[PDB]
Design an enzyme around this catalytic site. Sequence first.
Site, PDB file in Angstrom:
ATOM      1  N   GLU A   4      -6.106  48.191  50.872  1.00  0.00           N
ATOM      2  CA  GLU A   4      -5.870  46.760  51.012  1.00  0.00           C
ATOM      3  C   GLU A   4      -5.203  46.471  52.354  1.00  0.00           C
ATOM      4  O   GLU A   4      -4.174  47.067  52.687  1.00  0.00           O
ATOM      5  CB  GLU A   4      -5.008  46.240  49.862  1.00  0.00           C
ATOM      6  N   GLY A  29       5.470  47.969  49.649  1.00  0.00           N
ATOM      7  CA  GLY A  29       6.400  48.429  48.640  1.00  0.00           C
ATOM      8  C   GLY A  29       5.678  49.190  47.549  1.00  0.00           C
ATOM      9  O   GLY A  29       6.184  50.192  47.037  1.00  0.00           O
ATOM     10  N   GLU A  70       3.296  45.372  39.837  1.00  0.00           N
ATOM     11  CA  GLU A  70       2.066  46.132  40.031  1.00  0.00           C
ATOM     12  C   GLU A  70       1.240  46.191  38.752  1.00  0.00           C
ATOM     13  O   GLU A  70       0.005  46.142  38.804  1.00  0.00           O
ATOM     14  CB  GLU A  70       2.391  47.537  40.533  1.00  0.00           C
TER      15      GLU A  70
HETATM   16 ZN   LIG Z   1       1.072  41.892  44.720  1.00  0.00          ZN
HETATM   17 ZN   LIG Z   2       1.391  43.864  45.910  1.00  0.00          ZN
END
Ligand SMILES: [Zn+2]
Ligand SMILES: [Zn+2]
Length: 890
Positions: free
Chosen positions: A137, A279, A316
């Site tokens: 991503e 993160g 997540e």
């Molecule tokens: Zn997200």
């Molecule tokens: Zn994310």
Amino acid sequence: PVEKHRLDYKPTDFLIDFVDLDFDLYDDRTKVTSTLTMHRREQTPPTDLVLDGEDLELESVELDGNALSMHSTETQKGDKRVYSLDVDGRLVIAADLLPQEAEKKFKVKTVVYVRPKENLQLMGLYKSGALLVTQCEAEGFRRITYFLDRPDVMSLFKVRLAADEKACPVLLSNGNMVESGKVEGEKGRHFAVFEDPFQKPCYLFALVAGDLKSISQSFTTMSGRNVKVSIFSEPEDSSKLTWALESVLKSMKWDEERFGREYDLDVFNVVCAKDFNMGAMENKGLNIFNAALLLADPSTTTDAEYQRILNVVGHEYFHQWTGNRVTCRDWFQLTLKEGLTVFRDQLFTADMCSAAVKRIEDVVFLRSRQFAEDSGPMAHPIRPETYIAMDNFYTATVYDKGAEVIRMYHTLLGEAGFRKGMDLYFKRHDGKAVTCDDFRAAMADANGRDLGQFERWYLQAGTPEVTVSEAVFQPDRKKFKLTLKQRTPPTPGQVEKHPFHIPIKVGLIGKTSKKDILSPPTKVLELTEAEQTFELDAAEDCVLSFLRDFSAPVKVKHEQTDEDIAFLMAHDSDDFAKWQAAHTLASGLLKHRAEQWREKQGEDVEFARLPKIYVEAFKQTLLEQGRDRSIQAYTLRLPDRDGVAQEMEPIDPLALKEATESVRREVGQLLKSDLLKVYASLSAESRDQSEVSRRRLRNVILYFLTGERDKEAAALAMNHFKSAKGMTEKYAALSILCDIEGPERTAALEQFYRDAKGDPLVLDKWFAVQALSDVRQVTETVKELQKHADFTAKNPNRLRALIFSFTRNPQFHNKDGAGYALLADSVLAVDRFNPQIAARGAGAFLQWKKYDETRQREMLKQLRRIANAPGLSVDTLEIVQKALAGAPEE
Ligand SMILES: [Zn+2]
Ligand SMILES: [Zn+2]
């Protein structure tokens, strides 16, 4: 590349039906054999096939088993079985070689090589410690093999991984493992095959290979299905995973109860990565986490980091539905999954911890980081209209303001109405790539509500400003007249701002009742015009409680006397507005003292004594019994400096720092006896919220007991440092000591380094606490720490620990420009291997226009030095181009 526009979207020319991947994993050079089963879209003429591909070493191209040669001048004379590479490296196959019928499938097989150890961008396949990990991503999968690298292309995946059996005993990919065994010809290597039964976009792909240990636990969904949840990490960290595992189980149960969301796979895997830009990443069934957001230990992890791990773990998992099963049609819709998932983890964290504490934290972060972005050259709506580098728009606006926009849905429709919109949203678009308008239409259709004006939250950037133009009690009619105005300043590319649909929660506190007089106590006002008058039922004389729960992400202009503010500080019912009343009073005192300091540049600045309204309310909050100690600590804590600076023009961080210290020292003297009494009462590691609140209030009181920064202050903080049984009280005492030059600061820092025992996360704090120190020559200390043996710019966490923390130091804006040049030199070096981190580092130069002329010239010089650097990345170029858009030419 050229600028991309939201309204230029068009479905792909070709479809991808199946992806067959074969990885021959090596640290220096990995072979990726990929076969794509594709076909052209229905009712479309024949056209050339163009596949995304970045930094790939191409070996062979095969179309339906027939090899194609590289197009060259020699192939032009006769050879038609050729492929071409465009100027950007994309694979091109002429339409004459592809089937004429649209529905006819064809196979494109490629063999490419990549270099994980040289992949310092951390996008695609790269090495992280003893692990080979991936990050795709948004557009990183094209750095692995050729593909239609866009989220609206979904396909079934079959992934084979081959690697050294001693170095990579654990092999992981999306889906279920269907085969494992030894490599036939090559001894010492083994393989594994993974098949994903559900189609997914390429940015959700992931693979992990290395030495991993895991803990696990089963979870029974509401249908009765058993899901094996496992947390993976390198051996040395494998005993620090219980907090993350317990967080996944809470997240799965919460999503079932609160939104009826049920996991659909047999396995849910989480892998820790020590070198990670984000993160965490929500790769389908194979989440990859930054080590700082997963590993937890009482001797190394603070209470805040403990809560942050619970929040991100939930975030997540919530992406599995709001992001994975329902994904984005294009990257302009990033807030469709990010804004909705952040709001989901905010509700989750509120239920797991404290709702008021979390709301105050989210608002403070919004009004500092996001408000600065929304008033600067990079200001963009939560659904942007244009972008150059998509990695530049994973921002506080798209994430955190987008969540505030989702929360406004919840405010306008109510809980049950919001839930009905979610059910219809999931029912309509499960397994599809949709847009923001699809989510808004689901909320509108499910509730019979017109949300046409609400779309302006998606279209218009900038922070709206709500003015209380009139608020008077009318005793003859038993009514309270409230007139409100809204206006929004221009932002880059959009000067006129049409009125937003602003829900404004209000309440009235009777002057006699000393409690709410509205029924219900909080009323949602819908400010839909540029100016609007509302009439509330008020039986007695009242005091207005405005914008309860921060019901809209706006600035508020509301003139109140100190008596009415003191009245709300003591009798308001809304937890946020009660804290907001105290925050408003302290912010005004901080802001005024900073303007006095800014007027004389610290040359003979005399401050008026703090008003009794502030001190008496501080004392009442300090000595209060039975209340929530976390709310106590957040009410007594001085306002965040970055938040106050956003209300100032010009911004003077040195003046704001001295104003903060003067208030800290004066209240420490006025209530020294009461502060010492409460401080001793909070003595004597549990994860219970009661103990977290106790330590939080204890650390805040220590801050007010050490303002003098003398020998007595250093001794008190050193005892707090040495006697600490956990990282929470230890780091807090160290942070206070680092502002006091002396032997206690040097001894604490030296002991802190040795107590880390090589722990990279503890060493990050060691770098950060020095970069944020309010000491002389802190810039030279930061510049010298760049030569330290434990500092490497190639690790994003270590780089951010030193450099990014320094940008938040008020001495970073020293008028000599040494701090600006340090960041510019860092950004230039980092940009040559990691454009993502360098672009975010350069963002500290965005608000140059808000500072004084001296700082403007220095920041404009470094901005131009970066912009003129040869070989500057597309990411960092866009950031500093936007910053210089309103700057003089040349
Ligand atoms: Zn997200
Ligand atoms: Zn994310």
